[PDB]
Amino acid sequence: PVGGTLLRTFTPAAANAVYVVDPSKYVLTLTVGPTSVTTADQVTFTQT
Amino acid sequence: AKYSIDPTTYHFVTHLAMGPESCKKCPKGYFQPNIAGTVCLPCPSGFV
């Protein structure tokens, strides 16, 4: 536990490294058809 | 450095005793009998 000796050291190893992301930085848009339409009218998800 | 980045602790705090690794041991020629161990008194006048 205290001191002793070093046994092993892992490494991120060339693009398996931890990267930290700021969720506030992401920006998304949905823009999927109308909003007020009724149960009759189909809403259209535009994936592009 | 930012005033936005999450702060660890107060401003006026400068050093801290984080974990038991901080408990470094006296070099040869210095005894420290007490438990608190604020300072390590040098061995007096001849003792080793």
UniProtKB/TrEMBL annotation, chain A:
It comes from Chlamydomonas reinhardtii (Chlamydomonas smithii). It comes from the Eukaryota. This is Mastigoneme-like protein.
